[PDB]
Amino acid sequence: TNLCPFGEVFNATRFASVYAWNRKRISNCVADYSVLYNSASFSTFKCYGVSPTKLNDLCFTNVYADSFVIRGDEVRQIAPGQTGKIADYNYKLPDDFTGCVIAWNSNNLDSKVGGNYNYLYRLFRKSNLKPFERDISTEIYQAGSTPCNGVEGFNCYFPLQSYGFQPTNGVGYQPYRVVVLSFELLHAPATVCG
């Protein structure tokens, strides 16, 4: 009964842009990973810090479910020690992440005949993001010596760029929904278990 609502995350009708990575908190519920085991439609399923198998026999203080959307080529980028647009300007991981990562194409859902541009990504930022940092600031980037006084143009760019997702897009360019399931265990009682 007291089962963790992972379904609403993976079966969510809509997702967020990567720069605005959506988060869910999971606590005080039974940890049922069978949905992952049964679900064979996972494009990529890679864990770190702990094996996915001996998890339903293991407790933790809390669980964090990160969700966002990228393209196929950026799937490799969702991991520790990764570099790239998504790695540094839209989402990040520490050098000691403990959890799992899942990715699956959503071209049938996250693409339009006219192109699905609802999902965006940060393309510029004066410094790399800190681990598990979310940035949605609408500040105009200063690319040149001339300050950008809230206006766009020369050396003044909109930080967000919209993805081009269409049914005809390439595999590396078709949309993919990505989830990060992180388990935290501190010197506190664990309210979630298998």
Epitope: K46, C47, V50, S51, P52, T53, L58, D96
Partner: antibody
């Protein structure tokens, strides 16, 4: 005192299928996960796939993901390894290995003697 | 992904000498490293797990240390039966495990 017996190894043409058997003894085959490790001639070790203790969770290496199959029968304490549509790259020595379950991270505790598999047209 | 470099590729040592082997990773792992031993022809065998834990039935001369990217395996006093090839394998990547290139130890004659 742990005994493992690989069997079913042999030679076949590329694109065919082969079944390999690991026989468990002197331990609870049902209460530990199993890994398959292959080592090409002259090279070192190469991880392939792993199965849970209960046989409900399955995982494979990217190099063979969607091409191999791992299954087990705890009643018989037997471990089955099916390899469909084999490539020349698959010629190596296979070993079966126990889980150990001593950590949240996988180590390798025991190994069998291994069996040889070759692919050639 | 993750790559493991084991050094030296091969070393010459005699009985009673203290041997040290280094294994390095592309990125950092806390203690997700193992050392295994495999004689020529014989099947692989485990020596050390977690990089800081002696396996049961293994002589005390084998000792493991290091964390993050660099790990060391040290033998206080070499023995004739220890002349084998040692593999260092990372465990941080459960579903994409990778092993070291190997380090074959010969007799220093």
């Amino acid at each position: 005192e742990v005994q493992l017996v690989e069997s079913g190894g042999g030679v076949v043409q590329p694109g065919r299928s082969l079944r390999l058997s690991c026989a468990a003894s002197a331990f609870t085959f049902s209460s530990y996960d199993m890994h398959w490790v292959r080592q090409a001639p002259g090279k070192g070790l190469e991880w392939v796939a792993v199965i849970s203790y209960d046989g409900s969770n399955k995982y494979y290496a990217d190099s063979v993901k969607g091409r191999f199959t791992i299954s087990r029968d705890n009643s018989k304490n037997t471990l089955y390894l099916q390899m469909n549509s084999l490539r020349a790259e698959d010629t190596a020595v296979y070993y079966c290995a126990k889980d150990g379950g001593k950590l949240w991270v996988y180590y390798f505790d025991y190994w069998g003697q291994g069996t040889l598999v070759t692919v050639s047209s | 992904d993750i790559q493991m470099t084991q050094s030296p590729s091969s070393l010459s040592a005699s009985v009673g000498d203290r041997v040290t082997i280094t294994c390095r990773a592309s990125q950092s792992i806390s203690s997700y490293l193992n050392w295994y031993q495999q004689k020529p022809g014989k099947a692989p065998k485990l020596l050390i797990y977690a990089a800081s834990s002696l396996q049961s039935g293994v002589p005390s001369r084998f000792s493991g240390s290091g964390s993050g990217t660099d790990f060391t395996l040290t033998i206080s006093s070499l023995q004739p039966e220890d002349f084998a090839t040692y593999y260092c394998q990372q465990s941080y990547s459960t579903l994409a495990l990778t092993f070291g290139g190997g380090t074959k130890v010969e007799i220093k004659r």
